[PDB]
Specification:
The PDB classes it as transferase. The chain is of the alpha+beta class and 172 residues long. It contains 6 helices and 7 strands. It has a 7-stranded mixed sheet with strand order 1-2-3-4-5-7-6, sandwiched between helices.
Length: 172
Amino acid sequence: NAMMEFRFCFKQMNKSQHELVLGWIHQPHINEWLHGDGLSNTIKDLHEFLNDGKPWATHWIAYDNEIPFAYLITSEIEKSEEYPDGAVTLDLFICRLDYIGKGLSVQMIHEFILSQFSDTKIVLINPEISNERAVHVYKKAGFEIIGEFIASWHPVPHYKMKLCIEDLKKQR
């Protein structure tokens, strides 16, 4: 009545995409921000995920029709603390240079959350403060800075940023 779609596709990784993503996360534009212990941890966990191990996170790939272009990593936080309904923590990597547009990244973020976590209350993302473009894109997507911290894997300042899924929907 008078008071009443997505471009991208997302799937959990499978072994056939392993080498693709491995190449992706060794590109200089990615290694600007993913390196050292962060990179090492990523490679290990992706392997555990793909090989019926004990992965800590879920590993995803984003598609634009037939074209894979991004790699995303999610892990859940149990109900408790400041997150009584829990929360999902997101890491993302736009791995094709022709896909790096800020407006495109925001759309991908929104479509991923709505396609895979529509039932979730809160998404958290944690960029290095120096990664000015990421901070800017996440703010554009509706994430708000809720604190700063020094990351165990890369002990420089980072923001803790939070997005309300229900705000996203009402504003979507």
